[PDB]
């Protein structure tokens with residue numbers, strides 16, 4: 001046992017091919033009503049990760065890097081596509097002008113263990129109980145910072161986990177260099193993000209989680225979750241209630257750095273149910289997000305790509321369904337084809353219906369607007385089950401998204417809503433072990 005004995009060297013080959021076409025309702029467009037190219041690219045990633053063992057069972061090191069390789073990109077494809085690297089190397093230099101290949105050092109961390117306590121420092125991903133999170137493409141984003149936590153297992157009485165994380169820079173996986181954190185104006189600095197959270201597992205399928213976070217001088221962020229599982233008619237019903245909240249520290253609602261008025265939140269209820277080869281999902285969300293921004297963010301810095309935060313609800317139906325006032329219901333099914341002697345293969349689909357979405361409360365926007373949006377998707381996926389390629393994911397995802405207004409994308413006070421789309425994503429994720 002130790003630094004070398006327990007070392008691993010692993011990697012990944014990743015392939016992404018996407019066609020996303022979006023209806024253009026920009027008033028002066030020559031292609032008004034047409035589904036023009038929004039994304040059209042073919043891109044690979046390659047990753048390699050060294051993870052040491054623990055010298056003296058207390059000290060180790062992880063180093064990971066990845067490259068992006070561009071096979072094809074239409075001149076009309078938008079930027080950044082989040083699989084290649086943005087042509088701009090840091091968060092706040094983003095101008096949406098290009099994508100490129102490159103290489104990024106995405107993990108470079110000292111790791112520590114001392115009794116029940118653990119820590120990681122350097123270029124790290126959040127790994128404990130806080131509400132800080134990386135963005136995920138094929139690879140995760142990278143914080144410059146440190147996290148420490150502990151776990152106390154009380155056996156029958158349950159297990160407690162908690163951790164604290166602090167960071168002063170970040171890069172999304174589409175940026176090669178870390179940037180600092182700033183307010184909405186992309187100028188006023190935010191000297192750190194930090195977060196504290198906890199989890200208690202009662203060992204009877206009840207799990208409680210909670211976390212608090214701050215962007216220095218700017219945003220307070222909240223998370224709570226209760227999860228439970230029990231049988232309904234002989235089959236497991238999994239349930240969760242989730243609360244996500246945020247407030248800024250700029251009360252003046254017309255200040256350009258004010259993003260929320262009072263407390264903003266996203267609340268969710270989820271149910272999952274398995275019957276034979278079918279896995280069913282029924283989920284719903286509701287949002288309050290008064291203020292200039294007009295939608296809820298799980299991340300504590302508002303600028304695109306600038307950080308991320310924990311959000312357990314993911315419907316893969318293109319829209320975030322997170323506008324001020326918006327309510328949304330999701331229904332989905334996946335069918336395991338093992339009984340057709342296609343083990344590892346699954347197919348499914350899903351549907352979202354959302355309504356009551358309101359714009360930003362900034363008075364320059366028409367406050368009478370109420371927006372509905374809906375979507376459906378289809379899924380086909382295979383996980384290879386034997387051979388050197390065991391664990392490889394091959395997946396095709398297809399979405400039709402419908403914005404039930406004529407508002408041009410990102411317009412009308414709906415700064416996070418875009419127009420109708422057809423989206424086709426094909427991906428291969430092939431992990432491999434060197435030692």
Ligand SMILES: CCCCCCCCOCCOCCOCCOCCO
Nearest residue numbers: 208209210224225226227241242243267
């Ligand atoms: C310590 C973990 C607690 C997780 C359970 C959710 C409690 C979060 O409360 C936030 C405020 O919620 C507003 C009230 O909404 C109705 C409550 O929904 C069901 C609560 O289980």
Ligand SMILES: [Ca+2]
Nearest residue numbers: 087098099100
């Ligand atoms: Ca380019």
Ligand SMILES: [Ca+2]
Nearest residue numbers: 248250258260
């Ligand atoms: Ca405010």
Ligand SMILES: [Ca+2]
Nearest residue numbers: 402403404420
């Ligand atoms: Ca429409």
